[PDB]
Symmetry: C2
Subunit: 226 residues, 2 copies
């Protein structure tokens, strides 16, 4: 819609950092089960995030990641679970950026937006990954659920972003790949833009998107200022 926004808030894992690369970078070691493992790891890490907040038993995102990975390795009865867990947690700690992430953030930063991350991950796994892909240098601020001990899409975390960044919901453009994160952010009040790389079908229709695009780079036409 109309364009007087002070802030671009990014989800990290799956939006700017490519989680698929965790298992992809190590697919040969895993064996033919790699896709399925990858998929179960993602789904569980999120399950553990959502259920743990509903049952009032927070733990940090890294331990969730770890717990979820262990579960998935056992599910698939893999040899050398010890080795694979090491190899794969490490690969997670240093996920690669989508090819466009840095440049498009650079373009937004130098356009006068506050450019921030709002992620589930504790600062440690998050910092290591921003360091490794060098997105450290293209960010004003990086905000963690771990600061509140609460997971998305709980409205408190979107709230904490307004608080920390000193902006109102409607002065935020919230960019993410996860329909549930966009549904949660929108219901809260952010202008939501979905990065939909593969064209998956829509979900969370009650919190309609402001726009969908298929690439970080398309954000640039979407947001560039006079």
């Amino acid at each position: 819609l109309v364009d007087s926004l002070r802030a671009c808030v990014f989800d990290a894992y799956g939006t700017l950092l490519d989680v698929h690369s965790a298992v992809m970078r190590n697919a040969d070691e895993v064996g033919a089960s790699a896709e399925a493992l990858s998929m179960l790891w993602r789904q569980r890490q999120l399950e553990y995030s959502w259920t743990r907040t509903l049952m009032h038993q927070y733990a940090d995102f890294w331990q969730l990641t770890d717990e979820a990975l262990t579960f998935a390795l056992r599910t698939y009865h893999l040899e050398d679970r010890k080795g694979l867990k090491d190899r794969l947690m490490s690969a997670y700690k240093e996920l690669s950026a989508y090819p466009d992430a840095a440049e498009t953030l650079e373009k937004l930063k130098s356009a006068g937006y506050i450019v921030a991350i709002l992620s589930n991950g504790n600062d440690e796994m998050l910092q290591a990954a921003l360091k490794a892909s060098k997105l450290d240098r293209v960010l004003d601020s990086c905000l963690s659920a771990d600061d509140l001990k609460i997971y998305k899409p709980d409205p408190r975390i979107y709230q904490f972003a307004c608080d920390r960044l000193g902006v109102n919901p409607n002065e935020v453009c919230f960019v993410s790949s996860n329909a549930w994160d966009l549904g949660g952010a929108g219901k809260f009040g952010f202008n939501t833009v979905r990065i939909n790389r593969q064209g998956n079908p829509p979900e969370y229709e009650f919190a309609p998107l402001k726009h969908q695009v298929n690439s970080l780079s398309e954000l640039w036409p979407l947001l560039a200022k006079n």
Copy 2:
């Protein structure tokens, strides 16, 4: 604790009612992605229940079931989605019980236990499923998350069971096949028993189990009062 229990509370979908059967009974019409499509439908049904309850946007279980099925079928670019959606919805409306559900419930009831379902399902879907599988008449109570507009495993749902059943947490035996549901109940105070049919690895360990069995019928040796 072992035997000052007054109540067995069962999860429905996935514990007494078999959700595989919905797709499994239509596998041939669906094609080779059946088993994928089935998992995706289960994972999305639940995702919607948890994330909607987290963002304060409740819709009932039938709707979420519908949305998740639509999303799944689209994802697999399947053909004849319309007909495929009616077949699969109806299959879910009247899910068939596990082979042993009836007997073991009826044995538990008549051993003097209060015998209840506590489900995410709303009434219409739950009643249709309990009628069709004949599980209706062997239950003292059927308790639905849609009375609260809050899903498992927020504590208030398990609290609802206590309240309506007039028992305390430690007097309830909570039977389910879902680790997260067991997690939720465990943490809230129920005594937990997992029906782990396929031998899945553990999860939600901070809320340990009272017992695990691989079948509903193994619940009987264990709970004889």
